[PDB]
């Protein structure tokens, strides 16, 4: 078993974390367990504070910050967990003083936007930062020599049981009925659309347009909704004034073509990595009390132009490892 670690400049304190990928189960988020090794040679008026910051960038704004005092340990505190904070303490059996945090169940996941032609040090998005620093008091200024900062992210995977089969139909009017293969799709799976356009009018369908669209609601941006097409399909299929057309199509979203677009959401990046399109956000029971970050959803579109359109929702996320 391997464990991640990081140290401050001047080598005074060091922070250990077992992973920087915390799965957010739909019922309870995973906890963050870390161990701090420090040497109090003359730390008479010095205390160790470990913080967990969830911030939204553009200047930045945070809605969940916390502070945990590791040394001197607070009396009547909780027991450390045996998964990490027992083996780590056994290895550093001299001054290993642990810390722990718990994440509220309704915090947004780590999703970053695509910057495009301009760089601002770090791209827009939501990121979780773990900052551990020694200081005389919590309210006083601390400089980079005394602070350890490590970036983590929160993710969630696909549900085990698939949902109902998506389908949507609309309307001597013409009738169009569409369907997908299944409810949940992965990041490389081809999204097939079943199409049937029975006609009774004299207006013939000229061109069938199908696209996959990514919806990213930003609550902090005055509840703005930005949608972009991540897939495009154009087969130029026409039907007779009053005929019956049934066909299967195929689409596959990918980042290579969408790199040109700006403001498009991507998965959490540790440092300037390449990541897939942002996964869907699973909201617990529809209680939309989260007002911090961004939520991503995907809906397929099927459009017909005469000489009407239906939208089919689905989810796009990785399977459980």
């Amino acid at each position: 078993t391997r464990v991640f670690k990081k140290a401050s400049p001047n080598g005074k304190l060091t922070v250990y974390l077992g992973k920087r990928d915390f799965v957010d189960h739909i019922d309870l988020v995973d906890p963050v367990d870390g161990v701090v090794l420090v040497d109090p040679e003359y730390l008479k008026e010095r205390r160790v504070y470990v913080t967990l910051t969830v911030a939204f960038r553009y200047f930045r704004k945070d809605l969940f910050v916390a502070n945990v005092q590791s040394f001197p340990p607070a009396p009547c505190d909780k027991k450390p967990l045996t998964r990490l904070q027992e083996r780590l303490i056994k290895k550093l059996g001299e001054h290993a003083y642990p810390f722990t945090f718990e994440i509220p169940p309704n915090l947004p996941s780590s999703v970053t936007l695509q910057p495009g032609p301009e760089d601002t040090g770090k791209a827009l998005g939501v990121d979780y930062e773990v900052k551990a620093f020694v200081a005389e008091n919590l309210e006083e200024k601390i400089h980079k020599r005394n602070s350890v900062r490590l970036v983590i992210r929160k993710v969630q995977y696909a549900p085990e049981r698939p949902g109902p089969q998506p389908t949507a139909e609309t309307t001597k009017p013409l009738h169009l009925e569409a369907s997908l293969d299944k409810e949940i799709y992965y990041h490389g799976e081809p999204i097939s659309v079943n199409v049937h356009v029975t006609n009774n009018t004299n207006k013939t369908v000229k061109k069938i347009k199908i696209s996959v669209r990514q919806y990213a609601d930003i609550v902090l941006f005055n509840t703005a909704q930005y949608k972009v097409p991540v897939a495009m399909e154009e087969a130029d299929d026409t039907v007779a004034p009053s005929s019956t057309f049934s066909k299967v199509y195929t689409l596959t979203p990918f980042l290579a073509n969408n790199r040109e677009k700006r403001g498009l959401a991507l998965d959490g990046k540790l440092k300037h990595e390449d990541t897939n399109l942002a996964s869907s956000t699973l909201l617990r029971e529809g209680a939309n009390r989260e007002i911090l970050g961004i939520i991503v959803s995907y809906k397929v579109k099927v459009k017909l132009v005469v000489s009407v359109a239906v939208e089919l929702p689905f989810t796009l996320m990785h399977p459980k490892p």
Partner: antibody
Amino acid sequence: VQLVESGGGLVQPGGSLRLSCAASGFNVYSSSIHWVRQAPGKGLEWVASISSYYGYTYYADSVKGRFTISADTSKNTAYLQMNSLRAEDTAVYYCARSRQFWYSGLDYWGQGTLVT
Amino acid sequence: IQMTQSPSSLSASVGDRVTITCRASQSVSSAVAWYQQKPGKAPKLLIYSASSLYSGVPSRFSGSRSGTDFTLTISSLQPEDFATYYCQQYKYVPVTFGQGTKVEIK
């Protein structure tokens, strides 16, 4: 499910060639296609690789100046145009697949077509 | 990054412990895979990652990592594992393979 390479050649030193690799069973955006080259009696030397989801390609040092890799998204096939020389005129070129997301190890392999 | 592997090793028909090591010249964070190539056939992936098996591989095969040192182990050698094994690292873009260790029957 499986990979089949339909390529092959017999080239005088300093010409051109073309390798094709048909893949049936998995998509080309959910997987990464690599070409591995085994000289007779020598180890497996890595050659051009393509990640169609991102669109960029890596090249070996000995092939960076001559080889060119491409993929056909319409039929799930990988193309490896060559301008081989004497040093590459004895090897057997494989076509193996790796998972696109969170893996780079190669799980499915082709039979391999000799190039000379 | 030069990945080095131990030379060919003998063996016995009756199952016995066989350890094959691959010494990485540069540190790789447990991103190492092991293969098996019988003569005249394509290599077969054996290990997903150091100490992690692959779907369909029997339970005898095992792996381990000791810093920059990796190891492949077989708990019991039946006469079907007599092939050659390659150690590969997939951390850096210039992917390299080991020289390959050929197991033989005595």
